[PDB]
Amino acid sequence: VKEMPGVSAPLGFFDPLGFASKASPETITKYRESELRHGRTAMLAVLGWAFTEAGCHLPVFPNAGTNPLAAAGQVPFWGWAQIFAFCGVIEFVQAKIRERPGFQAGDYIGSGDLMDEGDDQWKSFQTKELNNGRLAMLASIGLIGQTAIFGQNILEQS
């Protein structure tokens, strides 16, 4: 839908390939959910990539502090298992959210039942989140790509 947040941009509504042109409300809601999940995950991924690149490593990961893709190996299988468990717990919470009648895509704060009235500033700030998230998605995929192709790694003239 054109009214939902994220639209404000130089491009305006950006749907070259028809995906929301005839999509039922369920499919558009799922598309927005995916966009927000990817965007937030990418924002965190870029921030973590910056943290690792700058040498900022936890005391428990002393040896590996140079290349994030290299650092990924240092994590034992059970560390990744616990990452997955935590993400699954949050996903279970969000699934419990979506059962509530008045759910809007990505509004895990229940803004509809919280705001005194729907506002334009709220839409603009949701758009800010979506835009920084889209940029973070592109930037994170680009970071991984540029570091895989050229092994020198960011901050090393990459």
Binding site: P59, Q121, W122
Partner: protein, 741 residues
């Protein structure tokens, strides 16, 4: 021209008629004394201008002239200090040999044998050793003669006279109108660009032209007699070019933009001067020049008469988000229509700033030969810490006063103040929880360590050789500050302070400053500090928020700012006013600052202050017993209080005997305060009734009937004596412990 000068000529007649009518200012006290309570009230409401007139203009004119009077008093105090330095001090002898000569600028008349207090400080001089660091300050200014101190005192006296005359003139002859006072933009521009901007610029000029060359000559070993007078450094440029061969170029680099040519005397080396043990004078000159530039720039931010500038009213109205309703709408009116609000902010900021000064001055000794003067460092730190605490609590009290008196709900609808008042319960409940959590955990660490050490289970304590609580974050910050020179501050040769890391700066075999390592004891004491600060904030914030109303007294505001109670109803309603919250907050602030001062003193004596050998070996005052003894309450009781109290108790028969006498007197006053703190007014009133019967039986009966102190006055007197006793006890303890050296 919206900003303009408005005054009333001959606002008040000058006469002594009022001086013979005490209590004239207040309507109630003007009727004369019926009982002794009147007397007390006359000294309690003297400066409560807001309660004497309903007009803001009159209160503003009184405040302005009272500030002039305070400036006159401060200038007289400075004049006295400088004059006692010039006529009654060994400043010249200390100049010649600063390390050995002990500063002293006070002499006692021999009248009852008190001349023993005239210590053998040195320099063929006898007097009371001073710990105000005035000698180091004067040396940093390149005084080098007592004529200059004498003229400094004369100028201070003339300035005190001018301040007194200005106060009289601006009350009784030309009193500015209210519209003149309500210029926040113009006032801020003038106080930033000129008072703080040009003040810094002028002091930087002084340092560049006077302090720098004189101190450089002194460090080279030139005797003060052979150092040319400071004015000689302003007439012949070459005479300064020898010291800093960049004047030869003159001021042309400054205007051409080639400021780099001034790096000779405008440096960024940081660290400490190895010779004097203080900060480099060139560093301070560059510092003050940069601050002058910044303050001058910041003084043009606000709009006064020409369109350009910032309107703080619009600025505040603009900042509002979803969570805070109307945002900062109505704060400008609050801060331009009530002196209590402004005083609260200013006192809080001044107190925090004083504490920051205390923390920064010890870590980076700014004056020559102040670092190795252990007595001066400790005195300055503790003095400014106490001043900061008092100012913070005063800011709290005046915030509460504003809330009770100058708060108007009509002009504060759904703004920040309204919302804070509307979730005060949540704020106070959470502050209470965090205070309890901090107290429990932090103090129970000490209790646990004490219990385990008493049970012989040393391996179960929270110590370095036991369960370890390392302040990892503080250590990481210290490491980053250590690595800053060359990487994050590339143009800084040395770290800001040697506390974080580096060499051991020692002057004359005394450790001026060395790195301070943080261990588990530091962790525990820091969390104790946080606990005490949080509790004090709890008390004062609760006093401020619940000053107008509460679930006990829905109409507390009508009762006033300070009142004893609202009767024994609803259970009991003792100490329910905001003034009583300030009364308790003063106790808690005193406790917290006592802990802070003990931490500083013991840590510096055990880990920083000491002596060095030609090889480089370090021997501290207490042998580094802080790590393994500061982790139990018994350790503090034994190794800090009992051990370091030897000097005071054994000071009898020496020049420090005055410190022992004051130690005992402070103990006495502290115990005396408990008489007012514990007891109530009814007992004393009945006792006074019996005593009055005794007087009457002999036809002795004052017309002014005696009365027991009011409840509020009883609490105030108890608190005042409690604070005086505690402060004096620690004052004597520290000064005698740090002057036996």
């Amino acid at each position: 021209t919206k900003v303009k000068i408005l005054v009333e000529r001959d606002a008040t007649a000058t006469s002594f008629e009022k001086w013979a009518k005490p209590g004239h200012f207040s309507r109630t006290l003007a009727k004369g004394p019926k009982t002794t309570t009147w007397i007390w009230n006359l000294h309690a409401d003297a400066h409560d201008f807001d309660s004497q007139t309903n007009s803001l203009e009159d209160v503003s004119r009184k405040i302005f002239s009272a500030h002039f009077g305070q400036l006159a008093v401060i200038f007289l105090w400075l004049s006295g200090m400088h004059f006692h330095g010039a006529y009654f001090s060994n400043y010249l002898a200390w100049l010649n040999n600063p390390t050995s000569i002990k500063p002293s600028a006070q002499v006692v008349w021999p009248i009852v044998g008190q001349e023993i207090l005239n210590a053998d400080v040195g320099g063929n001089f006898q007097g009371v050793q001073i710990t105000s660091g005035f000698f180091q300050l004067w040396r940093a200014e390149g005084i080098t003669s007592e004529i200059q101190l004498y003229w400094t005192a004369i100028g201070a006296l003339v300035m005190s006279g001018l301040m007194l005359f200005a106060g009289w003139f601006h009350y009784h002859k030309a009193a500015p109108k209210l519209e003149w006072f309500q210029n926040a933009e113009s006032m801020l521009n003038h106080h930033l660009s000129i008072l703080l901007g040009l003040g810094c610029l002028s002091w930087a000029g002084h340092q560049i032209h006077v302090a720098l060359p004189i101190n450089k000559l002194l460090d080279a070993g030139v005797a003060p007699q052979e150092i040319p007078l400071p004015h000689e450094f302003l007439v012949n440029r070459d005479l300064i070019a020898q010291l800093y061969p960049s004047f030869s170029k003159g001021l042309v680099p400054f205007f051409s933009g080639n400021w780099s040519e001034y790096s000779d005397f405008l440096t960024f080396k940081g660290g400490v001067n190895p010779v004097t043990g203080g900060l480099w004078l060139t560093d301070t000159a560059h510092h003050h020049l940069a601050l002058a530039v910044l303050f001058i720039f910041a003084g043009h931010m606000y709009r006064t008469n020409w369109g350009i500038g910032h309107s703080m009213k619009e600025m505040l109205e603009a900042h509002k988000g979803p969570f805070t309703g109307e945002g900062h709408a109505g704060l400008y009116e609050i801060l331009t229509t009530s002196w209590h609000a402004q005083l609260a902010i200013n006192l809080a900021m001044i107190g925090s700033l004083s504490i920051i000064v205390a923390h920064h001055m010890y870590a980076m000794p700014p004056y020559p030969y102040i670092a190795t003067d252990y007595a001066t460092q400790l005195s300055l730190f503790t003095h400014h810490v106490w001043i900061g605490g008092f100012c913070i609590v005063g800011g709290a009290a005046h915030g509460a006063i504003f809330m009770v008196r100058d708060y108007n709900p009509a002009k504060n609808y759904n703004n920040l103040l309204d919302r804070v008042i509307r979730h005060r319960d949540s704020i106070i409940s959470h502050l209470n929880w965090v205070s309890i959590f901090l107290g429990f955990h932090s103090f129970g660490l000490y209790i646990h360590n004490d219990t385990m050490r008493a049970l012989g289970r040393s391996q179960d304590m929270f110590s370095d050789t036991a369960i370890q609580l390392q302040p990892i974050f503080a250590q990481w910050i210290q490491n980053l500050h250590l690595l800053a020179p060359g990487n994050t501050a590339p143009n800084a040769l040395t770290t800001a302070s040697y506390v974080f890391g580096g060499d051991v700066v020692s002057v004359g075999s005394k450790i001026a400053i060395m790195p301070i390592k943080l261990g588990t004891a530091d962790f525990m004491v820091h969390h104790i500090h946080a606990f005490t600060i949080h509790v004090t904030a709890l008390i004062l914030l609760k006093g401020v928020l619940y000053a107008r109303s509460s679930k006990l007294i829905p109409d507390k505001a009508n009762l006033g700012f300070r009142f004893p109670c609202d009767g024994p109803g609803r259970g009991g309603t003792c100490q329910v006013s905001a003034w009583d919250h300030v009364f308790l907050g003063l106790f808690w602030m005193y406790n917290s600052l006592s802990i802070v001062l003990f931490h500083f003193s013991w840590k510096m004596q055990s880990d920083v202050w000491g002596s060095v050998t030609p090889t480089g070996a370090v021997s501290h005052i207490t042998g580094g017993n802080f790590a393994q003894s500061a982790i139990t309450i018994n350790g503090w009781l034994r190794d800090f209080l009992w051990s370091q109290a030897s000097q005071v108790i054994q000071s009898y028969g020496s020049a420090l005997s005055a410190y022992g006498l004051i130690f005992l007197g402070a103990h006495f006053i502290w115990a005396f305060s408990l008489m007012f703190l514990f007891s109530g007014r009814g007992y004393w009133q009945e006792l006074i009734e019996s005593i009055v019967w005794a007087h009457n039986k002999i036809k002795v009966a004052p017309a002014i009937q005696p009365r027991a102190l009011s409840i509020t006055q009883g609490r105030a007197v108890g608190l005042a004596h409690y604070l005086l006793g505690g402060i004096g006890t620690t004052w004597a303890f520290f000064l005698a412990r740090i002057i036996s050296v």
